[PDB]
Design a binder for these strands. Sequence first.
RNA 1: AACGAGACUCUGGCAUGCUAACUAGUUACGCGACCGGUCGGCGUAACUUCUUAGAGGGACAAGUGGCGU
Lengths: 314, 189, 61, 139, 130, 65
Amino acid sequence: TEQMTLRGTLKGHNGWVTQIATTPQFPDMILSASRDKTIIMWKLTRDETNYGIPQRALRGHSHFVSDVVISSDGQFALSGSWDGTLRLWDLTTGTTTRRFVGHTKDVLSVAFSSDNRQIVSGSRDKTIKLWNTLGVCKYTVQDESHSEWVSCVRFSPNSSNPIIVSCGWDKLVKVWNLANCKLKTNHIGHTGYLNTVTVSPDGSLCASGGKDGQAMLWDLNEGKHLYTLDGGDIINALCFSPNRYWLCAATGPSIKIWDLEGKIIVDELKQEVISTSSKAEPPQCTSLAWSADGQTLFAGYTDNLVRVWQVTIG
Amino acid sequence: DIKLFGKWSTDDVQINDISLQDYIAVKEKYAKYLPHSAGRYAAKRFRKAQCPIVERLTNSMMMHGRNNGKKLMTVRIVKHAFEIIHLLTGENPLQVLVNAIINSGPREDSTRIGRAGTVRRQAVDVSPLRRVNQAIWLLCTGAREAAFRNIKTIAECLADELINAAKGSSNSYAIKKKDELERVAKSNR
Amino acid sequence: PIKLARVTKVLGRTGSQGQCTQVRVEFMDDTSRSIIRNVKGPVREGDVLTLLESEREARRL
Amino acid sequence: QSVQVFGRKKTATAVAHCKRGNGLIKVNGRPLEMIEPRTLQYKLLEPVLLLGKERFAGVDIRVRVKGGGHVAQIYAIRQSISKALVAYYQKYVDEASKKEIKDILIQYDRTLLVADPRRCESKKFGGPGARARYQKSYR
Amino acid sequence: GRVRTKTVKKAARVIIEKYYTRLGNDFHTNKRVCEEIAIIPSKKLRNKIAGYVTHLMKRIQRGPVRGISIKLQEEERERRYVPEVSALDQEIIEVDPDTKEMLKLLDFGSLSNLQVTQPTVGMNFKTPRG
Amino acid sequence: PVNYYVDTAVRHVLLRQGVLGIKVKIMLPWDPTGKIGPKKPLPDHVSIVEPKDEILPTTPISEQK
RNA sequence: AACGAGACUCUGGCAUGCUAACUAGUUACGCGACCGGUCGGCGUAACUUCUUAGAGGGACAAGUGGCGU
């Protein structure tokens, strides 16, 4: 009964966007990593010619900015890139503060806890690295972490025990404990390599999307496979909706927004406007971000462009 | 807006041919403050048409051995010729330059068929970019052997072979040798 | 009778030393008279020539 | 308030330190009208004759040049000022005015913001230069 | 020109035939997976291989590629199909009179699904030679 | 690779009626150093490891540890 | 399959990412000189943009449109 409209496009980049970060502290500032060594802090003017402007580019890296997670307050950001470093910024300055050295390969995904004192980083080094905010290597997981790369690591935004999860290219969804670093649960249910895992905002439901295109639902605190969502091609992102209680599955050319319980698609988000490029492939949805209100969905594609959405309340 | 040498307006000029429409430079966005911009236009095919034509004249003006690298001696020749044109014809020195380019380039040529030394030609069309290149190679040539030893300075003699080439007069060196290339173009047809 | 012309497509490159490009030539008076005229110089598609005579067909050299 | 960038032609490197001020632009301790090749004065003044003194109103740049020749020093300077205002208007002013400056700068001439990479070739034995050969005889 | 020699193409083809699941359509991801699977010396060879792997994985999705294994190339298509009723499950099978004589000698003249069409009446089936 | 994978030797032998000269070259093997041959491989020799058969899944197994 | 070609090695171009630098410096602070300015003028101080040289990235016909059994 509610649609998803193309309200605007966030056109400011040159490379493929990989992650967009949102905050409840600021419904106006938007940070989006990309594949052109630059995170651009957006300012949503919400004008009819443009929904947002670029405000302050965070030009600090030397390779592809693979991931961006921001703090509770809207001043700090944790960023991973393919050079192996982590750039901890300070958003009012447009200037970095820290640099985390110790990853010899491409840092794939990072995550930031609520207390802004725990930093986890998953890389092509097959190592899980726990970082203090100053720069201390708190724990390197050499506890038989993963036989291949770790695609996405995530914290758990729960009132329960804060837990971490680590999907890998060896098709294993491993659950480890904070300040204990012991494997809690293995999930062997995927054909094809895992890409993204994210947790429902209650901190009890985890979805895992892989190469098969099948989002597998998992519990955190008891850990069992609940539902088996199906999609099209390879999942590139997974989110949740804290207000509308939906599963934000990101297939390639379209976002298949799914219901968590009914498993009914609200809208199919596929938009083609040209006919000259019919012999090529449409851009793939890599970046998916759900804002605090849930009214605005920030989706980013490989056409170096981020498409914002508005929910037609009807 | 942008004035060549800070004093010549660039928008009041008007080309006449459409055969040399795009292969003649500045109308609205090739307006440069100086001729020498030092771009790399000989990198790929069909890129010397998109450099300013005053720079084309200065590049084809350093074409003697003793002057084969001197460009700051060459921008003070177009700077010391365009004022002479502006005092002799009383209008924009760029317009008369384009009119001297259009009337001087040959439009019909003959290619040699046969062995080495003997010729039996046949008439062929002339490409528009080659018509532009043949004009500056004749207009620039005419201002050297004229002003060689006839006391008069070479900077105003470039104006002497540009102003008399804009009108199509037969005392200018370029349209002479154009029509000597046209009489042999009539000889086969 | 100075006639002006278009360029549709260069065919090949001919002559003794390969200098002469062979181009299929359209007229600018919108007729479909597709004369073939040999041209000497760098020519691309979409050029516009000034043909003095406009009756002789192109022949090899 | 400090922004420091360089510009380059063949061997000349002209670094340029930009701070906020009144509009004092003095390369090598000299104002721009006093550089002894005055024949490329408009090449030197192409930034300020494109962006206007209002953008140069709250700035203060002293360009530090060395190396190269004369023309290569002039072309290294104008790249440095144009690259300095872009990084200044990026680090302190928002992205929008930086974009408005940068787009008209690349629309005028791409050399003003990115450098020309071509540099001298080695000499090869058998000739006076890089490709030209010594004249060979026959019979 | 930019023609890849048989070192690049041979290594790319055997990486395709061994690791089709790890590869994709992005160049830069295939650049990273080949440098951990394979021991490749100096970087310009690793980049030239991974470009051919991207160009090759683009072409397998459109159909067949003659250089790589048929069993794998066909199997992926199958994996990437069941019709609900079989194409051999027809209700009317149109046969000739001469076909029904063969079925009559096969004691299968009592079939219900047959519909004896009449054959065409002109004896013209050869090409007009000349 | 001719600088560290081969080693040349030129020896003159003196016979009764003149000089023979012999030239011997040996293309050294691999073994990242076993004190024999170079450590570096030949720069066009690509070596691809064999993949190990991962156990294929049938049911989504949520195995706690 | 092998030699030759290619790959390779050296060099040129990019890094406000990293490593550093009293025999290289920038910026700043006082001091000194002459009209807030000029100093290849003096000494401390943040630091590597310039300057050196290492490690590593980076470009692969990779993306798009044509022409291609």
